Amino acid sequence: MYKFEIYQDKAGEYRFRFKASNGETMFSSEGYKAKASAIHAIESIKRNSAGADTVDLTTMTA
Amino acid sequence: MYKFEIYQDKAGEYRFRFKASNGETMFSSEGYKAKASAIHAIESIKRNSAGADTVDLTTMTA
Incomplete structure (x- = not known):
């Protein structure tokens, strides 16, 4: 299906993808x-x- | 409660936080x-x- 793959980057930067x-x-x-x-x-x-709302802040006139 | 706030960074970098x-x-x-x-x-x-698995790769980092 899918999951969170937790790795560290070359910069020693702990992170996770989905x-x-x-x-x-x-x-x-x-x-x-x-x-x-x-x-x-x-x-x-x-x-x-999975039930959380999705709010877009970046709808900004520029 | 909590949600995804979608913004772009100063670098013009579209992103989202939770x-x-x-x-x-x-x-x-x-x-x-x-x-x-x-x-x-x-x-x-x-x-x-919310039901997805959490796999840690950086226990044996790649």
């Missing part, structure tokens, strides 16, 4: 701070993120 | 490419991400 059913990544994160911070971040997603 | 019930951000993304790509990414989350 996949899709067609076996493709749709985002990569900053990872927040560290591995412990990475899982804790993903813990937010596990709660109700 | 909040927590205590009114605090837990990640910021790369936003994938653009606004359309940002929402499409968040669409993956809406599906089953």
